Amino acid sequence: APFVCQNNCPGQLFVKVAPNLTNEYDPDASANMSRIVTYSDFWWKGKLVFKAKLRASHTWNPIQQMSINVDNQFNYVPSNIGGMKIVYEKSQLAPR
Amino acid sequence: HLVSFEQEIFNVVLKTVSETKVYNNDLTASLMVALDSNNTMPFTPAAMRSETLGFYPWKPTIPTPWRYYFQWDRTLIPSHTGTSGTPTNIYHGTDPDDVQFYTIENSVPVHLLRTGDEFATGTFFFDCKPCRLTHTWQTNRALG
Amino acid sequence: GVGISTGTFNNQTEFKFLENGWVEITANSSRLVHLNMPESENYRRVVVNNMDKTAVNGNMALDDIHAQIVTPWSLVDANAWGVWFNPGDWQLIVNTMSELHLVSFEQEIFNVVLKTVSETKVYNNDLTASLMVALDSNNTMPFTPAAMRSETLGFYPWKPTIPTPWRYYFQWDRTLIPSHTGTSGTPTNIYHGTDPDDVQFYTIENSVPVHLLRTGDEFATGTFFFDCKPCRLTHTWQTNRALGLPPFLNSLPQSEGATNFGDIGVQQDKRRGVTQMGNTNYITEATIMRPAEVGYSAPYYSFEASTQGPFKTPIAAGRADGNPRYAFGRQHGQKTTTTGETPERFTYIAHQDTGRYPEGDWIQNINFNLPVTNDNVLLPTDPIGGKTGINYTNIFNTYGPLTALNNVPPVYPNGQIWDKEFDTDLKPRLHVNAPFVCQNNCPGQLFVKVAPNLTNEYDPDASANMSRIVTYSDFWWKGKLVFKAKLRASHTWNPIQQMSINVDNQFNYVPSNIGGMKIVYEKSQLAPRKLY
Amino acid sequence: FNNQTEFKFLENGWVEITANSSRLVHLNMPESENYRRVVVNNMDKTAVNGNMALDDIHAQIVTPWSLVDANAWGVWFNPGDWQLIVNTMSELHLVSFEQEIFNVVLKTVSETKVYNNDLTASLMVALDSNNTMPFTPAAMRSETLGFYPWKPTIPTPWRYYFQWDRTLIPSHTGTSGTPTNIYHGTDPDDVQFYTIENSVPVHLLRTGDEFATGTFFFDCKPCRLTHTWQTNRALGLPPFLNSLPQSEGATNFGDIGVQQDKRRGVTQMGNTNYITEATIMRPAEVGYSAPYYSFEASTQGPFKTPIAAGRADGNPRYAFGRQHGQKTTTTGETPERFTYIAHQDTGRYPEGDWIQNINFNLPVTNDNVLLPTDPIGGKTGINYTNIFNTYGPLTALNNVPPVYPNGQIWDKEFDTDLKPRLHVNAPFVCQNNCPGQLFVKVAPNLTNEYDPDASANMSRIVTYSDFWWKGKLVFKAKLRASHTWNPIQQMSINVDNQFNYVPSNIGGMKIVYEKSQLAPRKLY
Amino acid sequence: QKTTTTGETPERFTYIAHQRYPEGDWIQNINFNLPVTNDNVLLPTDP
Amino acid sequence: DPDDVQFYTIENSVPLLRTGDEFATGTFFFDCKPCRLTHTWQTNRALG
């Protein structure tokens, strides 16, 4: 990663479904618990916040930059049957 | 820089399946949720197994089924193809004085969420140094 | 909780006759709106190519090629007069008002209900699941007025409504070279190209915030205020001959009968006056100067081509060869008990007399012989380019610094109310499609989508989309469009034209008690207005 | 001296660009102090039949002054800075402009040659803060101050058009005789002779003193660094596709559902039923067909009727020299040239234009349609799309992009009562008043041999000057945002274009055209 | 990966980050015989 | 290589003199750790 938390990081978030125990089960059984077929779905939301410094031009020459071109164009729009992709993108472009 | 982070889980629904299949709601049972707020459990991000939440907004996602990697004892002497015989390749179990067992239910508080309530991770903050999105070409030949 | 409804149905439109000759018209409206789930949640890029009907020569106008991003969301668009005012209201406003403004607009969704299908089909409420709703309050999405396809909400209060599935244009290249029946060349027609310069893929989920409603809570767009210019409910009759002072008459008709006429006494070259003919002495009403030109001629049935294919050049006014033609279905005014697929159709023959008559006009040489020889005059029947049916008026254009024009009239029920300004640096002077143009921003388009009601069958790896429980939603939309309008006046001695229920048209309004209703079109501009 | 550019940041995402530019400026004394009324001619070439387009006849007042003009982009921004301006920002406004001049030098030549110092004499300078002199922007002739800081540059000798009368009746190859091709002199009512000496007060400068302006403040409306891609066909709501595809691959097109004559919608023209994407009503018109390569005759001879946006025709072609961006190591006199194929889709494509008769019988027959293939006036080349004009009240246009480095920045609004809606040459047009031009001249080092009775030019010692110049030009601009899931186009250094931006072995340099309006914008 | 492809094969890539060359360097004897003799230099070619 | 290009000029980056006038810098201050003249006596043979 580019960042590492020195003291501590944000907490690890765990989720589990409480058992829908059937009436036939009781704890004296040796076998695994008999449950009703159950599933849960939920909506998640979060907000990372970054601080960033806008660059400034110090060379005379223009720097390399990330750009759509004729070749890579269709990577960034869906297909007929609803496909999507996310092609990788380089991340330390400007010459220091 | 990293500055702040938060989460919330909201608009929960729990459901059950009746056998064709028919789909029904649940309200008495709960979605169990726990936040390891002090990094007590072994720190194990999902990118190691490549199972973080999906990247497209307009699609459901699955959370990774969690496991943590235990203590164990094993030896393997190297060899290369064309060598005769078989190397010493044995598993020995565990060092019981280094073994540790972790469980959520005694390590972390649990919220029994239901179809009607939220859980909100508090606004965390970071101490991270500047990342710098630029690169250097100068080798040792190009110094001075 | 679930048990309590939240909002009240209301179509009761009311007239507040405020002070000093202005009336504030609160067009409340309400409908029941029915959504099915999307066909699939994935955004699809689709491209259409009717090579079949446009490989045949001479079918240049039939072209339908385009690309569009078929989108899971649906659009709830009220931008049509029929959604707001009933025929009694329109009778009133056209007969009694002169000028009209657009003040403010509001929306709220309430009483949302969501249902799923279980085995014949048996239907139940899913009290836990959700409807997604999203307002583009900043107009980040491209403006897509549904009236141009007759896809607004339905114009009847009592009958339910279905909202249009949303889609928007995505850039394409095409050249279609024209050809006639009997051209050998088999012209170039190539369906392909998207430039990287121009790609714009917009998604609701990223571009705007979204609310996840449940059966029990409401969404309300706050009061958005328009800024627009006035619209005139009155029409101008003076084409250029009827402007200014008429000539003086020396011999008035002595009889009462219309078969006799009055005479100018002074011979045509002895007359006084001002002219725009530097080398000719005759003064005649076809030649006397006038302050400026009313109306403008334009090349009629001109198609022109830019990067995205050929298109019809719009014209600001008509004399039918320029007046708009409308087409619409059961939900928008066709007699609802009719079988069959053919949309009802009308052409709005506007009363605005500032049109042109391309069989009436000619050009003649600067020497200006009065009895023109054939070589010194270009009649509208003469060929151009050797073609027999094409004449000079098809190429002609008189638009100038001098040409005055009226705005497009309202048209009831199928016409638009508002449109958005083009984001060009140089703005056009009028819009052919709507009377009012939002200068700053238009009201946010409102989008809706049944929240995915997943089965237990979803995974990261499945190539197929998620296995959806078949789910549908019905919600009660309510809108409040507030107009402001001045009352008419009575300058003339003799009464203006007014809308009325003449005995023949009567049973186009009162319900054909077999079950049907219709909504016949009404002229919007009735009274005359003096131009100069 | 300064040539740094500073990007100060303001509240809410505006940015202020303080562009500094400085130069070492060289000026020889005039050939003569005589104002000259020169009539200029190419009589034989324009009198050969068919050569009307090359008609150069004009009259001008040659002046004993030079013009210091900073009115082009390359004076102020370098390729590195222009990248950041183009690719991060959506809108741009001019704020303010000032000049100042410093470290004047003044010398004479004597006889190898000895280059004397002449601290006694003076350099002559005139700031036209009163906007008296007719505006004569050097960008159109590629004569601005040079687009590099380091090497010196020369200010161009100044001149302005006099009035003239000319007629040139056109004729084709093989027409009989020579058509009426005459210069009729000038009308007395139109005459305008100006002199700097009675238009502007003149400062005298020496080695040891300096000059500075006040800050001109601009009133201009925004230029946009983004382009509109939608034409008429892409406005509004697409038709609903009843039969969506079932496979990937471009061969699997989608099919709009119900037949042509039975679809719903609105059409502007209505004697026939068909609602199609060509015929569906759209809110307005983007662009317009201008009559292409129309030349019109004035009192002062023929001229090209300009066009608002191009599709090559109508797109601007710049010709420029070594001081303004041609590779300075080159020898010879052929100027470098580029045609700026602008990004805007506001143009028009004449080969797809067609007209058809009112009746609209659907598969059209030859006698009821007019095509670009078809003659007008018997001329087998010229077709109706040349004489066509569809400027109308519904036409909408986008002001001209910036052209870097040769393009002009600001330009003056014409004094006419009815003013044009856009200018062809400059993105910004200044309404109330415009930057005062700056003129420079060298005072005569008269010989002792001068007297007023001699009718030849005044005898002078060979004199020349150089001086350092410093302009400061301030812009305000707005930063863009990620309105869309895809990345936009951007300017970049790549394997092919890298050597354009870095010097040669001899240390010469070049500057290459950078497409400005580079990000897409939602039109409707 | 393309959401609509079938199959179990993952998509792979490597980050050629903008920023050693083992084939291009050597270790030699301290005495520094400039036209170096075989025994006095160790090269990447050498087993 | 195109990513690596860094062309610089004094005139475009950095902010005149004659006989009888002068130039001066601002006064700089360092924050370096001190240099020391001590001799470490432990060697490959001598340790502890």
GROMACS .gro file of N, CA, C and O in nm, chain A residues 2 55-59 61-64 91-96, chain B residues 130-139 142-143, chain E residues 17-19, chain F residues 2-8:
model
  152
    2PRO      N    1   0.034   0.241  -0.042
    2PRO     CA    2   0.112   0.365  -0.026
    2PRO      C    3   0.108   0.424   0.114
    2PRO      O    4   0.200   0.498   0.150
   55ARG      N    5  -0.056   2.022  -0.832
   55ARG     CA    6   0.078   2.040  -0.883
   55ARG      C    7   0.092   2.177  -0.949
   55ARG      O    8  -0.004   2.252  -0.965
   56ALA      N    9   0.216   2.210  -0.984
   56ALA     CA   10   0.248   2.331  -1.058
   56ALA      C   11   0.356   2.299  -1.159
   56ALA      O   12   0.439   2.211  -1.138
   57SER      N   13   0.354   2.371  -1.270
   57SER     CA   14   0.443   2.343  -1.382
   57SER      C   15   0.575   2.415  -1.363
   57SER      O   16   0.577   2.538  -1.352
   58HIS      N   17   0.684   2.339  -1.358
   58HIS     CA   18   0.819   2.389  -1.339
   58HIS      C   19   0.912   2.358  -1.454
   58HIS      O   20   1.005   2.434  -1.479
   59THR      N   21   0.890   2.249  -1.523
   59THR     CA   22   0.957   2.227  -1.649
   59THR      C   23   0.897   2.316  -1.756
   59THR      O   24   0.786   2.368  -1.743
   61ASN      N   25   0.873   2.161  -2.054
   61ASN     CA   26   0.805   2.060  -2.133
   61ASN      C   27   0.677   2.014  -2.065
   61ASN      O   28   0.669   2.014  -1.942
   62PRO      N   29   0.575   1.973  -2.140
   62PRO     CA   30   0.458   1.912  -2.077
   62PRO      C   31   0.490   1.774  -2.024
   62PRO      O   32   0.571   1.701  -2.081
   63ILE      N   33   0.424   1.738  -1.914
   63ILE     CA   34   0.444   1.609  -1.850
   63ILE      C   35   0.353   1.505  -1.913
   63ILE      O   36   0.259   1.539  -1.985
   64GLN      N   37   0.378   1.378  -1.885
   64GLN     CA   38   0.287   1.273  -1.925
   64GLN      C   39   0.161   1.283  -1.841
   64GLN      O   40   0.166   1.329  -1.727
   91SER      N   41  -0.009   0.544  -1.181
   91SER     CA   42  -0.038   0.628  -1.066
   91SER      C   43   0.078   0.710  -1.008
   91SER      O   44   0.064   0.759  -0.896
   92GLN      N   45   0.189   0.727  -1.078
   92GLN     CA   46   0.291   0.824  -1.041
   92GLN      C   47   0.343   0.892  -1.166
   92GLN      O   48   0.462   0.883  -1.200
   93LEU      N   49   0.253   0.956  -1.240
   93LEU     CA   50   0.284   1.000  -1.375
   93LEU      C   51   0.391   1.108  -1.379
   93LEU      O   52   0.485   1.100  -1.458
   94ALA      N   53   0.378   1.210  -1.297
   94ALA     CA   54   0.453   1.331  -1.324
   94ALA      C   55   0.601   1.314  -1.286
   94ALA      O   56   0.631   1.249  -1.186
   95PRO      N   57   0.695   1.369  -1.362
   95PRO     CA   58   0.836   1.353  -1.325
   95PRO      C   59   0.871   1.448  -1.213
   95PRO      O   60   0.846   1.568  -1.220
   96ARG      N   61   0.932   1.393  -1.109
   96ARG     CA   62   0.959   1.467  -0.987
   96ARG      C   63   1.083   1.552  -1.002
   96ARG      O   64   1.181   1.510  -1.062
  226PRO      N   65   0.272   1.212   0.367
  226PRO     CA   66   0.235   1.238   0.228
  226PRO      C   67   0.279   1.127   0.136
  226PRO      O   68   0.398   1.099   0.123
  227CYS      N   69   0.183   1.065   0.069
  227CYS     CA   70   0.213   1.005  -0.059
  227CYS      C   71   0.241   1.115  -0.158
  227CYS      O   72   0.197   1.229  -0.141
  228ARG      N   73   0.318   1.083  -0.260
  228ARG     CA   74   0.364   1.181  -0.358
  228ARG      C   75   0.355   1.117  -0.495
  228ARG      O   76   0.436   1.030  -0.528
  229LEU      N   77   0.259   1.159  -0.575
  229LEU     CA   78   0.228   1.090  -0.699
  229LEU      C   79   0.319   1.130  -0.814
  229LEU      O   80   0.269   1.165  -0.922
  230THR      N   81   0.450   1.126  -0.795
  230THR     CA   82   0.547   1.161  -0.898
  230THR      C   83   0.658   1.057  -0.892
  230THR      O   84   0.661   0.974  -0.802
  231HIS      N   85   0.748   1.061  -0.991
  231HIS     CA   86   0.854   0.962  -1.000
  231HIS      C   87   0.984   1.026  -1.046
  231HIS      O   88   0.984   1.129  -1.113
  232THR      N   89   1.094   0.961  -1.007
  232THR     CA   90   1.230   1.008  -1.032
  232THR      C   91   1.300   0.914  -1.130
  232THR      O   92   1.293   0.792  -1.113
  233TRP      N   93   1.366   0.971  -1.231
  233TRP     CA   94   1.441   0.893  -1.329
  233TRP      C   95   1.590   0.885  -1.299
  233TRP      O   96   1.657   0.795  -1.352
  234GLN      N   97   1.644   0.975  -1.217
  234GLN     CA   98   1.789   0.991  -1.204
  234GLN      C   99   1.852   0.870  -1.135
  234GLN      O  100   1.825   0.843  -1.018
  235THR      N  101   1.938   0.799  -1.208
  235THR     CA  102   2.025   0.698  -1.150
  235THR      C  103   2.144   0.766  -1.083
  235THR      O  104   2.155   0.889  -1.080
  238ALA      N  105   2.334   1.016  -1.286
  238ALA     CA  106   2.272   1.145  -1.310
  238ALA      C  107   2.271   1.236  -1.187
  238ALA      O  108   2.193   1.332  -1.184
  239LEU      N  109   2.356   1.209  -1.087
  239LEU     CA  110   2.365   1.290  -0.966
  239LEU      C  111   2.487   1.380  -0.973
  239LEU      O  112   2.595   1.338  -1.015
 1313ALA      N  113   0.562   0.016  -1.291
 1313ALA     CA  114   0.555   0.145  -1.225
 1313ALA      C  115   0.654   0.241  -1.286
 1313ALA      O  116   0.766   0.204  -1.321
 1314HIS      N  117   0.613   0.366  -1.299
 1314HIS     CA  118   0.706   0.470  -1.341
 1314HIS      C  119   0.808   0.494  -1.231
 1314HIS      O  120   0.772   0.515  -1.115
 1315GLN      N  121   0.935   0.490  -1.267
 1315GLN     CA  122   1.043   0.503  -1.170
 1315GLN      C  123   1.173   0.544  -1.238
 1315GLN      O  124   1.210   0.490  -1.342
 1345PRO      N  125   0.994   0.904  -2.281
 1345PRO     CA  126   0.907   1.022  -2.274
 1345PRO      C  127   0.861   1.060  -2.136
 1345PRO      O  128   0.833   1.177  -2.112
 1346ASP      N  129   0.852   0.965  -2.044
 1346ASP     CA  130   0.808   1.002  -1.910
 1346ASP      C  131   0.911   1.091  -1.842
 1346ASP      O  132   0.877   1.172  -1.756
 1347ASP      N  133   1.037   1.077  -1.879
 1347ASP     CA  134   1.148   1.127  -1.801
 1347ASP      C  135   1.188   1.270  -1.835
 1347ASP      O  136   1.278   1.324  -1.769
 1348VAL      N  137   1.127   1.331  -1.936
 1348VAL     CA  138   1.179   1.455  -1.992
 1348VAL      C  139   1.160   1.566  -1.890
 1348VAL      O  140   1.048   1.591  -1.844
 1349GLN      N  141   1.269   1.633  -1.855
 1349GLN     CA  142   1.266   1.748  -1.764
 1349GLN      C  143   1.357   1.857  -1.818
 1349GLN      O  144   1.476   1.861  -1.784
 1350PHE      N  145   1.302   1.945  -1.900
 1350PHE     CA  146   1.377   2.056  -1.959
 1350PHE      C  147   1.350   2.182  -1.879
 1350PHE      O  148   1.235   2.217  -1.855
 1351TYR      N  149   1.458   2.250  -1.841
 1351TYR     CA  150   1.453   2.364  -1.751
 1351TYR      C  151   1.527   2.482  -1.812
 1351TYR      O  152   1.621   2.464  -1.890
   0.00000   0.00000   0.00000
